[PDB]
Design an enzyme around this catalytic site. Structure first.
Site, PDB file in Angstrom:
ATOM      1  CG  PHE A   1      10.800 110.851  38.344  1.00 14.36           C
ATOM      2  CD1 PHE A   1      11.687 110.320  37.404  1.00 14.36           C
ATOM      3  CD2 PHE A   1       9.428 110.746  38.103  1.00 14.36           C
ATOM      4  CE1 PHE A   1      11.210 109.717  36.200  1.00 14.36           C
ATOM      5  CE2 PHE A   1       8.946 110.142  36.906  1.00 14.36           C
ATOM      6  CZ  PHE A   1       9.856 109.620  35.959  1.00 14.36           C
TER       7      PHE A   1
ATOM      8  CE  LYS B   1      -2.774 107.468  37.272  1.00 18.86           C
ATOM      9  NZ  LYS B   1      -2.597 106.103  36.777  1.00 18.86           N
ATOM     10  CB  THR B   2      -2.003 111.789  32.235  1.00 17.56           C
ATOM     11  OG1 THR B   2      -1.601 112.028  33.560  1.00 17.56           O
ATOM     12  CG2 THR B   2      -1.362 112.904  31.246  1.00 17.56           C
ATOM     13  CB  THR B   3      -3.904 109.296  27.934  1.00 15.78           C
ATOM     14  OG1 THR B   3      -3.951 108.084  28.766  1.00 15.78           O
ATOM     15  CG2 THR B   3      -2.448 109.513  27.578  1.00 15.78           C
TER      16      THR B   3
ATOM     17  CE  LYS C   1       0.127 104.206  28.213  1.00 16.56           C
ATOM     18  NZ  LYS C   1      -0.443 105.562  27.866  1.00 16.56           N
TER      19      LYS C   1
ATOM     20  CG  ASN D   1      -1.593 102.237  41.644  1.00 16.32           C
ATOM     21  OD1 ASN D   1      -1.889 103.390  41.947  1.00 16.32           O
ATOM     22  ND2 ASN D   1      -1.030 101.414  42.471  1.00 16.32           N
TER      23      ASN D   1
ATOM     24  CD  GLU E   1       0.300 112.760  36.836  1.00 18.41           C
ATOM     25  OE1 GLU E   1      -0.230 112.086  37.777  1.00 18.41           O
ATOM     26  OE2 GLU E   1       0.350 112.300  35.655  1.00 18.41           O
TER      27      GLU E   1
ATOM     28  CD1 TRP F   1      13.522 108.288  41.485  1.00 15.86           C
ATOM     29  CD2 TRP F   1      11.291 108.403  41.906  1.00 15.86           C
ATOM     30  NE1 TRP F   1      12.849 107.949  40.300  1.00 15.86           N
ATOM     31  CE2 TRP F   1      11.486 108.021  40.547  1.00 15.86           C
ATOM     32  CE3 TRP F   1       9.977 108.518  42.406  1.00 15.86           C
ATOM     33  CZ2 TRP F   1      10.405 107.801  39.685  1.00 15.86           C
ATOM     34  CZ3 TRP F   1       8.930 108.291  41.552  1.00 15.86           C
ATOM     35  CH2 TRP F   1       9.144 107.924  40.217  1.00 15.86           C
TER      36      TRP F   1
ATOM     37  NE  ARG G   1     -15.383 113.535  24.106  1.00 12.75           N
ATOM     38  CZ  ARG G   1     -15.788 112.398  24.675  1.00 12.75           C
ATOM     39  NH1 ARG G   1     -16.313 112.410  25.907  1.00 12.75           N
ATOM     40  NH2 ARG G   1     -15.535 111.222  24.079  1.00 12.75           N
TER      41      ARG G   1
HETATM   42  C1  B12 Z   1     -22.915 101.957  27.357  1.00  7.41           C
HETATM   43  C2  B12 Z   1     -23.395 103.255  26.779  1.00  7.41           C
HETATM   44  C3  B12 Z   1     -23.250 103.466  25.438  1.00  7.41           C
HETATM   45  C4  B12 Z   1     -22.703 102.322  24.491  1.00  7.41           C
HETATM   46  C5  B12 Z   1     -23.901 101.400  24.205  1.00  7.41           C
HETATM   47  C6  B12 Z   1     -23.479 100.024  23.646  1.00  7.41           C
HETATM   48  C7  B12 Z   1     -24.516  98.928  23.739  1.00  7.41           C
HETATM   49  N1  B12 Z   1     -25.059  98.522  22.603  1.00  7.41           N
HETATM   50  O1  B12 Z   1     -24.782  98.420  24.815  1.00  7.41           O
HETATM   51  C8  B12 Z   1     -22.158 103.219  23.283  1.00  7.41           C
HETATM   52  C9  B12 Z   1     -20.667 103.556  23.457  1.00  7.41           C
HETATM   53  C10 B12 Z   1     -22.374 102.606  21.883  1.00  7.41           C
HETATM   54  C11 B12 Z   1     -22.835 104.567  23.506  1.00  7.41           C
HETATM   55  C12 B12 Z   1     -22.703 105.646  22.541  1.00  7.41           C
HETATM   56  C13 B12 Z   1     -23.232 106.938  22.740  1.00  7.41           C
HETATM   57  N2  B12 Z   1     -23.834 107.376  23.856  1.00  7.41           N
HETATM   58 CO1  B12 Z   1     -24.225 106.288  25.382  1.00  7.41          CO
HETATM   59  N3  B12 Z   1     -24.452 105.482  27.073  1.00  7.41           N
HETATM   60  C14 B12 Z   1     -24.088 104.346  27.650  1.00  7.41           C
HETATM   61  C15 B12 Z   1     -24.358 104.295  29.146  1.00  7.41           C
HETATM   62  C16 B12 Z   1     -23.050 104.494  29.943  1.00  7.41           C
HETATM   63  C17 B12 Z   1     -25.027 102.970  29.607  1.00  7.41           C
HETATM   64  C18 B12 Z   1     -26.090 102.421  28.627  1.00  7.41           C
HETATM   65  C19 B12 Z   1     -26.793 101.224  29.240  1.00  7.41           C
HETATM   66  O2  B12 Z   1     -26.177 100.439  29.943  1.00  7.41           O
HETATM   67  N4  B12 Z   1     -28.096 101.087  28.960  1.00  7.41           N
HETATM   68  C20 B12 Z   1     -29.077 100.458  29.839  1.00  7.41           C
HETATM   69  C21 B12 Z   1     -30.353 100.061  28.977  1.00  7.41           C
HETATM   70  C22 B12 Z   1     -31.338 101.214  28.873  1.00  7.41           C
HETATM   71  O3  B12 Z   1     -29.730  99.666  27.701  1.00  7.41           O
HETATM   72  P1  B12 Z   1     -30.128  99.591  26.057  1.00  7.41           P
HETATM   73  O4  B12 Z   1     -31.086 100.795  26.015  1.00  7.41           O
HETATM   74  O5  B12 Z   1     -30.651  98.291  25.562  1.00  7.41           O
HETATM   75  O6  B12 Z   1     -28.796  99.973  25.140  1.00  7.41           O
HETATM   76  C23 B12 Z   1     -28.898 100.892  24.066  1.00  7.41           C
HETATM   77  C24 B12 Z   1     -28.909 102.313  24.631  1.00  7.41           C
HETATM   78  O7  B12 Z   1     -28.060 102.435  25.760  1.00  7.41           O
HETATM   79  C25 B12 Z   1     -28.436 103.110  23.422  1.00  7.41           C
HETATM   80  N5  B12 Z   1     -27.826 104.382  23.776  1.00  7.41           N
HETATM   81  C26 B12 Z   1     -26.619 104.612  24.377  1.00  7.41           C
HETATM   82  N6  B12 Z   1     -26.195 105.846  24.248  1.00  7.41           N
HETATM   83  C27 B12 Z   1     -27.200 106.484  23.521  1.00  7.41           C
HETATM   84  C28 B12 Z   1     -27.324 107.816  23.141  1.00  7.41           C
HETATM   85  C29 B12 Z   1     -28.454 108.238  22.439  1.00  7.41           C
HETATM   86  C30 B12 Z   1     -28.507 109.657  21.936  1.00  7.41           C
HETATM   87  C31 B12 Z   1     -29.493 107.305  22.135  1.00  7.41           C
HETATM   88  C32 B12 Z   1     -30.684 107.709  21.307  1.00  7.41           C
HETATM   89  C33 B12 Z   1     -29.375 105.980  22.544  1.00  7.41           C
HETATM   90  C34 B12 Z   1     -28.225 105.585  23.219  1.00  7.41           C
HETATM   91  O8  B12 Z   1     -27.477 102.305  22.764  1.00  7.41           O
HETATM   92  C35 B12 Z   1     -27.842 100.921  22.938  1.00  7.41           C
HETATM   93  C36 B12 Z   1     -28.332 100.413  21.599  1.00  7.41           C
HETATM   94  O9  B12 Z   1     -28.449  99.014  21.609  1.00  7.41           O
HETATM   95  C37 B12 Z   1     -25.341 105.488  29.276  1.00  7.41           C
HETATM   96  C38 B12 Z   1     -25.450 106.206  30.631  1.00  7.41           C
HETATM   97  C39 B12 Z   1     -26.190 105.352  31.641  1.00  7.41           C
HETATM   98  N7  B12 Z   1     -25.560 105.086  32.769  1.00  7.41           N
HETATM   99  O10 B12 Z   1     -27.323 104.948  31.404  1.00  7.41           O
HETATM  100  C40 B12 Z   1     -24.904 106.430  28.136  1.00  7.41           C
HETATM  101  C41 B12 Z   1     -25.831 107.467  27.430  1.00  7.41           C
HETATM  102  C42 B12 Z   1     -27.105 106.733  27.043  1.00  7.41           C
HETATM  103  N8  B12 Z   1     -25.044 107.755  26.216  1.00  7.41           N
HETATM  104  C43 B12 Z   1     -25.083 109.011  25.920  1.00  7.41           C
HETATM  105  C44 B12 Z   1     -24.324 109.578  24.796  1.00  7.41           C
HETATM  106  C45 B12 Z   1     -24.288 111.089  24.834  1.00  7.41           C
HETATM  107  C46 B12 Z   1     -23.711 108.766  23.878  1.00  7.41           C
HETATM  108  C47 B12 Z   1     -22.852 109.216  22.700  1.00  7.41           C
HETATM  109  C48 B12 Z   1     -23.330 110.555  22.093  1.00  7.41           C
HETATM  110  C49 B12 Z   1     -21.393 109.365  23.265  1.00  7.41           C
HETATM  111  C50 B12 Z   1     -20.368 109.986  22.262  1.00  7.41           C
HETATM  112  N9  B12 Z   1     -19.574 110.983  22.654  1.00  7.41           N
HETATM  113  O11 B12 Z   1     -20.319 109.495  21.140  1.00  7.41           O
HETATM  114  C51 B12 Z   1     -23.072 108.028  21.712  1.00  7.41           C
HETATM  115  C52 B12 Z   1     -24.400 108.198  20.966  1.00  7.41           C
HETATM  116  C53 B12 Z   1     -24.603 107.275  19.775  1.00  7.41           C
HETATM  117  C54 B12 Z   1     -25.640 107.939  18.901  1.00  7.41           C
HETATM  118  N10 B12 Z   1     -26.895 107.830  19.308  1.00  7.41           N
HETATM  119  O12 B12 Z   1     -25.312 108.579  17.890  1.00  7.41           O
HETATM  120  C55 B12 Z   1     -25.926 109.832  26.870  1.00  7.41           C
HETATM  121  C56 B12 Z   1     -27.275 110.139  26.193  1.00  7.41           C
HETATM  122  C57 B12 Z   1     -27.704 111.605  26.307  1.00  7.41           C
HETATM  123  C58 B12 Z   1     -29.028 111.867  25.621  1.00  7.41           C
HETATM  124  N11 B12 Z   1     -29.261 113.111  25.271  1.00  7.41           N
HETATM  125  O13 B12 Z   1     -29.813 110.960  25.394  1.00  7.41           O
HETATM  126  C59 B12 Z   1     -26.028 108.880  28.125  1.00  7.41           C
HETATM  127  C60 B12 Z   1     -27.344 109.012  28.952  1.00  7.41           C
HETATM  128  C61 B12 Z   1     -24.746 109.260  28.931  1.00  7.41           C
HETATM  129  C62 B12 Z   1     -24.719 110.629  29.700  1.00  7.41           C
HETATM  130  N12 B12 Z   1     -25.546 111.537  29.210  1.00  7.41           N
HETATM  131  O14 B12 Z   1     -23.964 110.847  30.675  1.00  7.41           O
HETATM  132  N13 B12 Z   1     -23.484 104.660  24.690  1.00  7.41           N
HETATM  133  N1  LIG Z   2       0.984 100.575  36.229  1.00  2.00           N
HETATM  134  C1  LIG Z   2       2.014 101.141  35.499  1.00  2.00           C
HETATM  135  N2  LIG Z   2       3.231 100.520  35.213  1.00  2.00           N
HETATM  136  C2  LIG Z   2       4.211 101.078  34.435  1.00  2.00           C
HETATM  137  N3  LIG Z   2       4.056 102.320  33.816  1.00  2.00           N
HETATM  138  C3  LIG Z   2       2.900 103.024  34.048  1.00  2.00           C
HETATM  139  C4  LIG Z   2       1.798 102.487  34.886  1.00  2.00           C
HETATM  140  N4  LIG Z   2       0.769 103.409  34.897  1.00  2.00           N
HETATM  141  C5  LIG Z   2       1.208 104.473  34.143  1.00  2.00           C
HETATM  142  N5  LIG Z   2       2.454 104.215  33.627  1.00  2.00           N
HETATM  143  C6  LIG Z   2       3.325 105.097  32.819  1.00  2.00           C
HETATM  144  O1  LIG Z   2       4.240 105.650  33.811  1.00  2.00           O
HETATM  145  C7  LIG Z   2       4.365 107.085  33.650  1.00  2.00           C
HETATM  146  C8  LIG Z   2       3.613 107.940  34.773  1.00  2.00           C
HETATM  147  O2  LIG Z   2       2.148 108.295  34.553  1.00  2.00           O
HETATM  148  P1  LIG Z   2       0.883 108.012  35.606  1.00  2.00           P
HETATM  149  O3  LIG Z   2       1.503 107.117  36.565  1.00  2.00           O
HETATM  150  O4  LIG Z   2       0.347 109.392  36.015  1.00  2.00           O
HETATM  151  O5  LIG Z   2      -0.259 107.198  34.810  1.00  2.00           O
HETATM  152  P2  LIG Z   2      -1.334 107.725  33.751  1.00  2.00           P
HETATM  153  O6  LIG Z   2      -1.574 109.235  33.903  1.00  2.00           O
HETATM  154  O7  LIG Z   2      -2.476 106.752  34.006  1.00  2.00           O
HETATM  155  O8  LIG Z   2      -0.521 107.349  32.356  1.00  2.00           O
HETATM  156  P3  LIG Z   2      -0.762 108.151  30.965  1.00  2.00           P
HETATM  157  O9  LIG Z   2      -0.034 109.421  31.121  1.00  2.00           O
HETATM  158  O10 LIG Z   2      -0.042 107.306  29.914  1.00  2.00           O
HETATM  159  O11 LIG Z   2      -2.236 108.119  30.718  1.00  2.00           O
HETATM  160  C9  LIG Z   2       3.733 107.297  32.254  1.00  2.00           C
HETATM  161  O12 LIG Z   2       4.672 107.067  31.205  1.00  2.00           O
HETATM  162  C10 LIG Z   2       2.574 106.273  32.181  1.00  2.00           C
HETATM  163  O13 LIG Z   2       2.044 105.829  30.884  1.00  2.00           O
HETATM  164 MG   LIG Z   3      -0.458 110.761  34.830  1.00  4.42          MG
END
Ligand code: B12
Ligand SMILES: Nc1ncnc2c1ncn2[C@@H]1O[C@H](COP(=O)(O)OP(=O)(O)OP(=O)(O)O)[C@@H](O)[C@H]1O
Ligand SMILES: [Mg+2]
Ligand code: B12
Ligand SMILES: Nc1ncnc2c1ncn2[C@@H]1O[C@H](COP(=O)(O)OP(=O)(O)OP(=O)(O)O)[C@@H](O)[C@H]1O
Ligand SMILES: [Mg+2]
Lengths: 169, 191
Positions: A64, A14-16, A12, A10, A101, A66, A24
């Site tokens: 809507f 989902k759609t965004t 905000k 529920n 939706e 409604w 992307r």
């Molecule tokens: C949280 C998270 C992040 C956070 C980490 C923040 C932090 N300091 O804790 C942020 C948002 C910064 C991040 C960014 C990115 N990540 Co990330 N991340 C995760 C996630 C969801 C959990 C990580 C975790 O909890 N680690 C647990 C332990 C191992 O933690 P840690 O090692 O101490 O933390 C470090 C690593 O996680 C590392 N890390 C995280 N992402 C990546 C990606 C790469 C390429 C490398 C080398 C390292 C790395 O960053 C931390 C540095 O302190 C995982 C998926 C998963 N469920 O595991 C993906 C994952 C690691 N991420 C991934 C990716 C793709 C990215 C991004 C490319 C996303 C994007 N579109 O920008 C960037 C890469 C940054 C770069 N290398 O240039 C992929 C990696 C794929 C691969 N080929 O290795 C994973 C496996 C997700 C997936 N594939 O579905 N990540």
């Molecule tokens: N909990 C909430 N209370 C009030 N307005 C909301 C809430 N959740 C979403 N909205 C807004 O109500 C309208 C219906 O969209 P929906 O309920 O599908 O949520 P959403 O897809 O998560 O929102 P968005 O489109 O902004 O990402 C949108 O203008 C949305 O931003």
């Molecule tokens: Mg929506």
């Protein structure tokens, strides 16, 4: 491989999230197709932005339930728009299909669940589908590879903030 | 039926008449589920589609190809991204801190710029959690920002004071993720 992603809950975002992922994909030159249910009677910033990049949008455009207060008219528009959804879901030239939706169409019996399941299961192997909306049928959730539920921790509408162009639509 | 629906309408309309402020808001996308960054950029795209002006600071390096940035940047959305050398390592903590403080100067500029309708602060939560960026700088910038500017903050583990300050917070719960099923990162989906 293509996966099915669901953005439900529920809060905000989902759609965004679905359209941030479309943004992307378009930014890496992938092809995206979009179907939006119910929506269409308000300005649509994501459509304004993405359609000129070659993202096809098909929208139900009834408004809507409604407001329309007309189950039959809504059901006819749902099914007509769904014909576009099924085409997209059959088009291997589309990397990603957004079904925004879609939840309510199944929940209100506008759109048979079985049609949704078999279209998703027949789709091209490389195609990813993003479904959004509150109240997603369990079977869609089970079929999905990724599900994020957006929990409504806080929403500015509760604190009295009006919907605004560029934020809420 | 018409009557059941009319009661819905009446409640929706009453909620609508009650909420008449128009101002900039703080949105936070947090939680372990996928969707935080992408919702932040779906919102920026929504804003650009209505001619609004968006600035973005990403508190991670930009070495991976970046679809959202590829799309949005030619529309005049300014991106500032963290220096390529950032390590996360204890040995390099002084340089990493300086890298974070440096893009943060651009973040402060954006958050003081009345021409920007929206500022995205993507993965900011780690910078405060890991002590790269002082909490007080973020809280003060956000409070002093232009009255009409919206800010979007993303990342797991957001500080409680930033959550209290936010107008809208969604926590993205990782109900399921394709990663746990062995599905690897793909272009267009995960980056
Ligand atoms: C949280 C998270 C992040 C956070 C980490 C923040 C932090 N300091 O804790 C942020 C948002 C910064 C991040 C960014 C990115 N990540 Co990330 N991340 C995760 C996630 C969801 C959990 C990580 C975790 O909890 N680690 C647990 C332990 C191992 O933690 P840690 O090692 O101490 O933390 C470090 C690593 O996680 C590392 N890390 C995280 N992402 C990546 C990606 C790469 C390429 C490398 C080398 C390292 C790395 O960053 C931390 C540095 O302190 C995982 C998926 C998963 N469920 O595991 C993906 C994952 C690691 N991420 C991934 C990716 C793709 C990215 C991004 C490319 C996303 C994007 N579109 O920008 C960037 C890469 C940054 C770069 N290398 O240039 C992929 C990696 C794929 C691969 N080929 O290795 C994973 C496996 C997700 C997936 N594939 O579905 N990540
Ligand atoms: N909990 C909430 N209370 C009030 N307005 C909301 C809430 N959740 C979403 N909205 C807004 O109500 C309208 C219906 O969209 P929906 O309920 O599908 O949520 P959403 O897809 O998560 O929102 P968005 O489109 O902004 O990402 C949108 O203008 C949305 O931003
Ligand atoms: Mg929506
Ligand atoms: C659920 C919901 C939806 C569902 C409604 C499903 C249905 N028709 O049965 C969906 C997602 C389809 C929807 C769409 C939209 N909605 Co809506 N929706 C809500 C919500 C969150 C709850 C409504 C409820 O049933 N109770 C309300 C917020 C609320 N708490 O009432 C907003 C709300 C009704 N929606 C609103 C908006 C802005 C929208 C959209 C423009 C969002 C968009 N970006 O597309 C569209 C408009 C659709 C159209 N008429 O063409 C505004 C309406 C403002 C007004 N003056 O009437 C509300 C009040 C939210 C807000 N202001 O923060 N909505
Ligand atoms: N729960 C998770 N399991 C596996 N991978 C995830 C998860 N959440 C996000 N990812 C992916 O890991 C990377 C780091 O993302 P982050 O923790 O910033 O989440 P996000 O901002 O919600 O993801 P996205 O950018 O896809 O919206 C991105 O490639 C992202 O798609
Ligand atoms: Mg992120």
């Amino acid at each position: 491989r293509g996966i099915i992603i669901v953005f439900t809950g529920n809060g905000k975002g989902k759609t965004t999230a679905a359209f941030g992922t479309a943004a992307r994909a378009v930014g890496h030159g992938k092809n995206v197709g979009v179907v939006q249910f119910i929506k269409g009677t308000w300005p649509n910033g994501e459509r304004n932005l993405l359609e000129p990049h070659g993202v096809e949008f098909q929208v139900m455009a009834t408004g809507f339930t409604w407001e329309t207060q007309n189950r039959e008219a809504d059901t006819a528009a749902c099914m007509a728009v769904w014909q576009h959804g099924k085409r997209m879901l059959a088009d291997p030239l589309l990397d990603m299909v957004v079904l925004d939706e879609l939840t309510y169409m199944v929940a209100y019996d506008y759109l048979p669940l079985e049609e949704v399941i078999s279209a998703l299961n027949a789709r091209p192997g490389h195609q990813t589908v993003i479904i959004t909306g509150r109240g997603c049928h369990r079977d869609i959730l089970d079929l999905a590879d990724t599900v994020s539920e957006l929990r409504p921790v806080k929403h500015a509408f509760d604190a009295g903030v009006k919907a605004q162009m560029g934020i809420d639509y």
